[PDB]
């Protein structure tokens, strides 16, 4: 059994590894299949001390990942793509 204090501390608003769909972050890249199609980014998550508050980023940074692009019938190659990470989270009202 997980004890109250530990559940509360682990679930409170903080950056957590989050699998983000690449097309969602790059909606202009319309004709590609991406491999992998999602990347693991540090994004805000978890809960706040009461329902009026929501968890939101306050400090951000970028991470560069090599991603394969495939236009079917045309070509295939890898290159670098940059993604937004969350470094610090704050509970703020909605």
């Amino acid at each position: 059994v997980v004890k109250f204090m530990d559940v509360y501390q682990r679930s409170y608003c903080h950056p957590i590894e989050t699998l983000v769909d690449i097309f969602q972050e790059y909606p202009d890249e319309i004709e590609y299949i991406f491999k992998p199609s999602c990347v693991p980014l540090m994004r805000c998550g978890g809960c706040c001390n009461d329902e009026g508050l929501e968890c939101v980023p306050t400090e951000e940074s970028n991470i560069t990942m090599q991603i394969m692009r495939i236009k079917p019938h045309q070509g295939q190659h890898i290159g670098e793509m940059s993604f937004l990470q969350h470094n610090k989270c704050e509970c703020r009202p909605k």
Partner: antibody
Amino acid sequence: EVQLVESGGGLVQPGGSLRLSCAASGYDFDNYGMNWVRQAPGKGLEWVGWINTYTGEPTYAADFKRRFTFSLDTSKSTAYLQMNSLRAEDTAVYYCAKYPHYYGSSHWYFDVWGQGTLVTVSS
Amino acid sequence: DIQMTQSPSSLSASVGDRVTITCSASQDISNYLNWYQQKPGKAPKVLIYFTDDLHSGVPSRFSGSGSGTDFTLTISSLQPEDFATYYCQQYSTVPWTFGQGTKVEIKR
């Protein structure tokens, strides 16, 4: 240093068959699509097709579907082009060429080429 | 199949001359056009992709322009080593196709 080294060319008889190979080094073979291009002596350039080095999926220019086959050996980082029912108009230098690293968006030019091997169709 | 047609087919110019090579496409290819240089006994070498993006390592005296069906490669100051055959290539639709080539000779 990225290099493609080709081999397998030489004499083959009209109606016969042979297999060319393209051995890649200096980069991860699976990450870049491999193209095949040919040039008949003193003439222009002709794109044969390309093969996806990650899945093995080939794509042929239509005029070459019936007599040309692409294949991979990824553990040897080699691509192969097999040709049969050869005619005299198939006499040419056959190149392989990898696609480039991308920056921002995909442009399908040929980045690094093999040195080419001449195939001569003659009995 | 998209037909690419270059002109002229060959030309002679002196060291220092501005040289111009055009390429017409049988149908609109937007800006999906590259330029290669091929020297005797060698594989072609890409000079320019995406109409006008200069490949790294390529002198800046080469440049490209155009759109739709008309495209141009310019050598703003022909150098002796620019002797070669120059080819354009469309990547708008498969199969990829090439122009017939333009031979560039240096006059001296």
